[PDB]
Design an enzyme around this catalytic site. Sequence first.
Site, PDB file in Angstrom:
ATOM      1  N   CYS A  46       0.828  -1.179   0.000  1.00 34.75           N
ATOM      2  CA  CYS A  46       0.000   0.000   0.000  1.00 34.75           C
ATOM      3  C   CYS A  46       0.868   1.236   0.000  1.00 34.75           C
ATOM      4  CB  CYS A  46      -0.896  -0.068   1.230  1.00 34.75           C
ATOM      5  SG  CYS A  46      -1.785   1.448   1.771  1.00 34.75           S
ATOM      6  N   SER A  48       0.729   3.645   1.847  1.00 37.91           N
ATOM      7  CA  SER A  48       1.086   3.974   3.225  1.00 37.91           C
ATOM      8  C   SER A  48       2.450   3.375   3.636  1.00 37.91           C
ATOM      9  CB  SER A  48      -0.027   3.579   4.175  1.00 37.91           C
ATOM     10  OG  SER A  48      -1.107   4.440   4.065  1.00 37.91           O
ATOM     11  N   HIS A  51       5.098   5.470   2.284  1.00 36.94           N
ATOM     12  CA  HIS A  51       5.234   6.750   3.004  1.00 36.94           C
ATOM     13  C   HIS A  51       6.239   6.642   4.133  1.00 36.94           C
ATOM     14  CE1 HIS A  51       2.146   8.599   0.736  1.00 36.94           C
ATOM     15  NE2 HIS A  51       1.117   8.410   1.525  1.00 36.94           N
ATOM     16  N   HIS A  67       1.139  -3.707   6.579  1.00 36.03           N
ATOM     17  CA  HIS A  67      -0.061  -3.700   7.382  1.00 36.03           C
ATOM     18  C   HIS A  67      -1.307  -4.222   6.675  1.00 36.03           C
ATOM     19  CE1 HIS A  67      -0.013  -0.165   4.924  1.00 36.03           C
ATOM     20  NE2 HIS A  67      -1.318  -0.236   4.976  1.00 36.03           N
ATOM     21  N   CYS A 174      -6.676  -3.394   4.333  1.00 35.70           N
ATOM     22  CA  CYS A 174      -6.501  -1.977   4.142  1.00 35.70           C
ATOM     23  C   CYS A 174      -7.219  -1.316   2.951  1.00 35.70           C
ATOM     24  CB  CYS A 174      -5.052  -1.522   4.161  1.00 35.70           C
ATOM     25  SG  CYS A 174      -4.964   0.288   4.106  1.00 35.70           S
TER      26      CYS A 174
HETATM   27  N1  LIG Z   1      -7.264   6.978   5.416  1.00 37.54           N
HETATM   28  C1  LIG Z   1      -6.836   5.728   5.491  1.00 37.54           C
HETATM   29  O1  LIG Z   1      -7.238   4.958   6.358  1.00 37.54           O
HETATM   30  C2  LIG Z   1      -5.841   5.245   4.511  1.00 37.54           C
HETATM   31  C3  LIG Z   1      -5.113   6.144   3.796  1.00 37.54           C
HETATM   32  N2  LIG Z   1      -4.395   5.779   2.694  1.00 37.54           N
HETATM   33  C4  LIG Z   1      -3.773   6.813   1.832  1.00 37.54           C
HETATM   34  O2  LIG Z   1      -4.499   6.892   0.634  1.00 37.54           O
HETATM   35  C5  LIG Z   1      -3.632   7.369  -0.422  1.00 37.54           C
HETATM   36  C6  LIG Z   1      -3.817   6.520  -1.656  1.00 37.54           C
HETATM   37  O3  LIG Z   1      -3.318   5.191  -1.415  1.00 37.54           O
HETATM   38  P1  LIG Z   1      -3.033   4.235  -2.657  1.00 37.54           P
HETATM   39  O4  LIG Z   1      -4.263   4.092  -3.477  1.00 37.54           O
HETATM   40  O5  LIG Z   1      -2.383   3.003  -2.149  1.00 37.54           O
HETATM   41  O6  LIG Z   1      -1.968   5.110  -3.466  1.00 37.54           O
HETATM   42  P2  LIG Z   1      -1.488   5.162  -4.987  1.00 37.54           P
HETATM   43  O7  LIG Z   1      -0.195   5.886  -5.049  1.00 37.54           O
HETATM   44  O8  LIG Z   1      -1.582   3.795  -5.561  1.00 37.54           O
HETATM   45  O9  LIG Z   1      -2.626   6.075  -5.631  1.00 37.54           O
HETATM   46  C7  LIG Z   1      -2.464   7.505  -5.642  1.00 37.54           C
HETATM   47  C8  LIG Z   1      -2.840   8.027  -7.004  1.00 37.54           C
HETATM   48  O10 LIG Z   1      -2.811   9.472  -6.979  1.00 37.54           O
HETATM   49  C9  LIG Z   1      -2.368   9.925  -8.229  1.00 37.54           C
HETATM   50  N3  LIG Z   1      -1.895  11.289  -8.079  1.00 37.54           N
HETATM   51  C10 LIG Z   1      -0.703  11.683  -7.538  1.00 37.54           C
HETATM   52  N4  LIG Z   1      -0.560  12.980  -7.513  1.00 37.54           N
HETATM   53  C11 LIG Z   1      -1.731  13.475  -8.059  1.00 37.54           C
HETATM   54  C12 LIG Z   1      -2.185  14.782  -8.304  1.00 37.54           C
HETATM   55  N5  LIG Z   1      -1.491  15.875  -8.012  1.00 37.54           N
HETATM   56  N6  LIG Z   1      -3.409  14.924  -8.860  1.00 37.54           N
HETATM   57  C13 LIG Z   1      -4.103  13.822  -9.162  1.00 37.54           C
HETATM   58  N7  LIG Z   1      -3.777  12.549  -8.974  1.00 37.54           N
HETATM   59  C14 LIG Z   1      -2.563  12.437  -8.417  1.00 37.54           C
HETATM   60  C15 LIG Z   1      -1.296   8.925  -8.635  1.00 37.54           C
HETATM   61  O11 LIG Z   1      -1.077   8.965 -10.026  1.00 37.54           O
HETATM   62  C16 LIG Z   1      -1.913   7.607  -8.155  1.00 37.54           C
HETATM   63  O12 LIG Z   1      -2.626   6.900  -9.158  1.00 37.54           O
HETATM   64  C17 LIG Z   1      -2.223   7.392   0.188  1.00 37.54           C
HETATM   65  O13 LIG Z   1      -1.909   8.702   0.643  1.00 37.54           O
HETATM   66  C18 LIG Z   1      -2.378   6.434   1.360  1.00 37.54           C
HETATM   67  O14 LIG Z   1      -1.390   6.622   2.353  1.00 37.54           O
HETATM   68  C19 LIG Z   1      -4.276   4.454   2.378  1.00 37.54           C
HETATM   69  C20 LIG Z   1      -5.054   3.566   2.938  1.00 37.54           C
HETATM   70  C21 LIG Z   1      -5.582   3.814   4.280  1.00 37.54           C
HETATM   71  O1  LIG Z   2      -2.702   2.567   5.095  1.00 35.57           O
HETATM   72  C1  LIG Z   2      -2.937   2.249   6.265  1.00 35.57           C
HETATM   73  N1  LIG Z   2      -3.025   3.099   7.305  1.00 35.57           N
HETATM   74  C2  LIG Z   2      -2.866   4.555   7.216  1.00 35.57           C
HETATM   75  C3  LIG Z   2      -4.116   5.235   7.757  1.00 35.57           C
HETATM   76  C4  LIG Z   2      -3.973   6.756   7.689  1.00 35.57           C
HETATM   77  C5  LIG Z   2      -2.742   7.214   8.452  1.00 35.57           C
HETATM   78  C6  LIG Z   2      -1.485   6.518   7.956  1.00 35.57           C
HETATM   79  C7  LIG Z   2      -1.644   4.998   8.011  1.00 35.57           C
HETATM   80 ZN   LIG Z   3      -2.777   0.841   3.754  1.00 40.09          ZN
END
Ligand SMILES: NC(=O)C1=CN([C@@H]2O[C@H](COP(=O)(O)OP(=O)(O)OC[C@H]3O[C@@H](n4cnc5c(N)ncnc54)[C@H](O)[C@@H]3O)[C@@H](O)[C@H]2O)C=CC1
Ligand SMILES: O=CNC1CCCCC1
Ligand SMILES: [Zn+2]
EC number: 1.1.1.1
Lengths: 374, 374
Positions: A46, A48, A51, A67, A174
């Site tokens: 993921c 995350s 990050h 995770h 996740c």
């Molecule tokens: N809130 C929560 O519980 C969780 C949060 N997250 C967060 O969600 C986010 C997405 O996770 P994933 O799908 O695994 O990431 P990913 O990197 O696979 O998807 C992100 C997408 O955003 C696009 N992107 C990047 N910069 C951009 C911009 N300026 N404008 C438009 N599109 C843009 C990328 O091309 C990519 O396709 C991450 O920040 C991750 O840490 C992940 C899962 C749990």
């Molecule tokens: O992707 C899994 N967990 C994330 C949830 C949002 C804070 C950072 C960790």
């Molecule tokens: Zn995650």
Amino acid sequence: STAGKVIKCKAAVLWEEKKPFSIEEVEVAPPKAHEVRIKMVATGICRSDDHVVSGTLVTPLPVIAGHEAAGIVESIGEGVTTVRPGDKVIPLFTPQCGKCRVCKHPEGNFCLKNDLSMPRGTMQDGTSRFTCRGKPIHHFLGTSTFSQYTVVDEISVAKIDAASPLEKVCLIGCGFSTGYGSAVKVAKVTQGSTCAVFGLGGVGLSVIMGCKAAGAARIIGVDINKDKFAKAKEVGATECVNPQDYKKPIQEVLTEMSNGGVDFSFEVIGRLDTMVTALSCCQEAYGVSVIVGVPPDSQNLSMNPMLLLSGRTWKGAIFGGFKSKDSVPKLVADFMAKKFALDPLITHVLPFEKINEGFDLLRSGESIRTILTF
Amino acid sequence: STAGKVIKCKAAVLWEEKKPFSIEEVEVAPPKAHEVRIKMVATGICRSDDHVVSGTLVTPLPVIAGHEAAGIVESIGEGVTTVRPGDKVIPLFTPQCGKCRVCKHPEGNFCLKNDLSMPRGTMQDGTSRFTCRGKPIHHFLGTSTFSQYTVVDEISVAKIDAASPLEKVCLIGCGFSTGYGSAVKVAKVTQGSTCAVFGLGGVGLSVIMGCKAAGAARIIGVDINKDKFAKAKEVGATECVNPQDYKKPIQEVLTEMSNGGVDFSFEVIGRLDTMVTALSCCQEAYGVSVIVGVPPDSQNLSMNPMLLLSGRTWKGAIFGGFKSKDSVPKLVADFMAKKFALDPLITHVLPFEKINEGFDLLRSGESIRTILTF
Ligand SMILES: NC(=O)C1=CN([C@@H]2O[C@H](COP(=O)(O)OP(=O)(O)OC[C@H]3O[C@@H](n4cnc5c(N)ncnc54)[C@H](O)[C@@H]3O)[C@@H](O)[C@H]2O)C=CC1
Ligand SMILES: O=CNC1CCCCC1
Ligand SMILES: [Zn+2]
Ligand SMILES: NC(=O)C1=CN([C@@H]2O[C@H](COP(=O)(O)OP(=O)(O)OC[C@H]3O[C@@H](n4cnc5c(N)ncnc54)[C@H](O)[C@@H]3O)[C@@H](O)[C@H]2O)C=CC1
Ligand SMILES: O=CNC1CCCCC1
Ligand SMILES: [Zn+2]
Ligand SMILES: [Zn+2]
Ligand SMILES: [Zn+2]
């Protein structure tokens, strides 16, 4: 054959930021009271996890990250009552203690026992079960799944269907749940509505999945990488736009496209600017915007509060707002009952040993989810 | 005798920022199609009118301000069907056209015909009905109640009970409804909950009234002026705190007092810092914060999005989220049936000619609401 004894196994250790993961032998201690030792079967990559490597997310190093996963209980500590050896399980990065105010609230899921707010990188007791070359190694969100074996607290694991495809359902750990629930539970997307989804990765695709399930009429995907558009449309997007194709700010574009703003917007990237943009593109009087993406550590956004005064609702959520222990098994059952699909999120499948290659894929834009198999 | 004829009357004209109002003769044109001319009976002094003077709220000058009021219809223009001469009415600063997408939405109230987002200071047709010293004068939010007579568009006026006491029900035109609605309709305060209200003026007191009506267990009033605590308690506050009395940030205080954060928080002042403080003091996982205060023109706040990511919901509203034309008559009927009280908000009464003394009272912290009589 290993119950009660230290296990030496392979894990992927991150010794410092901005370095590749180090594949090597670690020692994993036996579980103590209310602890569970799990043999990993599958783990997803993921954003995350990336990050932690890039410094966007701060957690004590060295650490065994990972995770989003699934495995099989190897052994349990004294007092455990919810899982047993041989059970298929999913580690929960957000725990469910069941005793705190949040756990007792009908709409809260961010259990106070989490390791997110004030990251320690340990077990609930303040120590670590991992050692590598004589050094203690930190845990990550009480999960640490980039290892052949892990130890988790009882409140951070759920028992799932014995017949589950672990190489698929690890995503319920996740990515899928986060996205899906952000749409169906947090935003509470309505039938006939117009939605905008910023970020078309695993989590964003899952948000789209949710919007479609909720009956949305229009689901606009937004990504700077056009290569992610076909998959978005396969899963439910009606239109996709790339901000770089336009001369004006994308919030303006989306407002025009939606004849005055969208009903629901979702930030699934992790950028401050896109969080503000996503808020802005939702209709000023009744719009709702949900932040899913993780922001770069300690950084503040800047916005005009008139965006909210007019009537907008802005919210965020961890893990799609799902109470983890309750929901995870339910979600696995739904998947077994063909209520949602996971295959569209899986682009690559690699052996665990190729973790770095998996991260390269993510960083290059080529993958959605790479599943690592042990 | 005045129908179809220009009316010469007294009004309080604001020629420039940060100066006293000038009470002098203006020329009020007769109503055009779908327009209503109103003989004003009573008007309140709200902080928003002071914001026009101070430049906090930007609207074109010179202007006839005032927007919380009640009067009697003097005449109607061609095509008016919802009011008649002799009817008691309340001008609506937020219109209800009934035709736009917002008016058709079940939750929305910020009608697209409003003069707040892009202030023009005119009638719906882009022109003014006011002349002073031979110069055209601007309208304010389509109301302009600081005059013996005003002209408003039909969508910006509601017919109320013929027996209403106009000196009291003028507050339903702004202050009471805004605060009350913010608690009961926007936040949707629950029985047994803990609430924090930042700002204990007319609007904040109305928020407290709403919280109490909704069944909150604890209602914590927050204000740097302690003199505003007694009345807050009278209307429902269980506790009052003065941030200047503490060494810690009031968010920390409130979090401690509420054993982890409050259920519902309200910003009813108009400062960027208190909007953030208010958000921060609600429970990180399930808390809700509502912005009611008006921020200084074009100013942006700074905040960490992790406050939302944990699960908080942050929202704002105009006029307590009430669809204006539908709601105002109802509120008056409820008032008539003693469902809520207005007298606690009225601290001072003056003749319209003493508008400046009324403003002095507000600025000196001495008053809540001063009602001006024509
Ligand atoms: N809130 C929560 O519980 C969780 C949060 N997250 C967060 O969600 C986010 C997405 O996770 P994933 O799908 O695994 O990431 P990913 O990197 O696979 O998807 C992100 C997408 O955003 C696009 N992107 C990047 N910069 C951009 C911009 N300026 N404008 C438009 N599109 C843009 C990328 O091309 C990519 O396709 C991450 O920040 C991750 O840490 C992940 C899962 C749990
Ligand atoms: O992707 C899994 N967990 C994330 C949830 C949002 C804070 C950072 C960790
Ligand atoms: Zn995650
Ligand atoms: N959203 C909407 O529709 C409406 C918004 N408003 C806005 O609501 C706000 C309140 O209006 P009124 O009650 O009329 O104003 P008011 O001035 O009477 O009350 C504000 C209170 O805030 C207190 N205060 C000032 N600085 C403070 C601080 N740092 N910390 C704590 N308390 C502080 C003051 O002492 C005062 O008692 C104004 O900004 C007004 O413009 C008013 C009407 C409708
Ligand atoms: O106080 C009455 N109306 C206000 C509503 C919020 C924006 C400024 C004008
Ligand atoms: Zn808990
Ligand atoms: Zn309208
Ligand atoms: Zn007002």
